[PDB]
Amino acid sequence: GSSGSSGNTWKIFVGNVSAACTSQELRSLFERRGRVIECDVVKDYAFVHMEKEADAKAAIAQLNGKEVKGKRINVELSTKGQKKSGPSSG
């Protein structure tokens, strides 16, 4: 069955965040690309949590690099470890 050791929701690390960038901006982006449960911004980096995995990656692709406020933001999946339980589709 399903399980969640910590922070079930997804997590996307966003770096190279312009200084004159407002959270609302980052959220809006991840929002337009898909559903966004939580969206916070750190000093220089950020952390966006999405529900739908499909949308998550899709965004990182259309976001990773996207020029924002003159500065190209670097988006990448925070979660490094992968736990794909069950066999592979055939």
Swiss-Prot record:
Cross-link Glycyl lysine isopeptide (Lys-Gly) (interchain with G-Cter in SUMO2), sequence positions: K57, K66, K69, K80, K84
Localization annotation: Nucleus; Nucleus, Nucleolus; Cytoplasm
Boundaries of every RRM domain copy: 10-80
Free-text tissue specificity from the UniProt record: Expressed in all tissues tested, including brain, heart, skeletal muscle, colon, thymus, spleen, kidney, liver, small intestine, placenta, lung and peripheral blood lymphocytes.
Transmembrane segments: none
Highest taxon listed in the record's lineage: Eukaryota
Role, per record: Isoform 1 may function as a nuclear receptor coactivator, enhancing transcription through other coactivators such as NCOA6 and CITED1. Isoform 2, functions as a transcriptional repressor, modulating transcriptional activities of coactivators including isoform 1, NCOA6 and CITED1. Regulates centriole biogenesis by suppressing the formation of aberrant centriolar protein complexes in the cytoplasm and thus preserving mitotic spindle integrity.
Assembly: Isoform 1: Interacts with NCOA6, CITED1 and XRCC5/KU86. Isoform 1: Interacts with SS18 isoform 1. Isoform 1: Interacts with SS18 isoform 2. Interacts with STIL and interferes with its interaction with CPAP. Interacts with gamma-tubulin. Part of the HDP-RNP complex composed of at least HEXIM1, PRKDC, XRCC5, XRCC6, paraspeckle proteins (SFPQ, NONO, PSPC1, RBM14, and MATR3) and NEAT1 RNA. Interacts with RBPMS; the interaction allows cooperative assembly of RNA-bound stable cell-specific alternative splicing regulatory complexes.
Name recorded for this polypeptide: RNA-binding protein 14
Gene this protein is translated from: RBM14
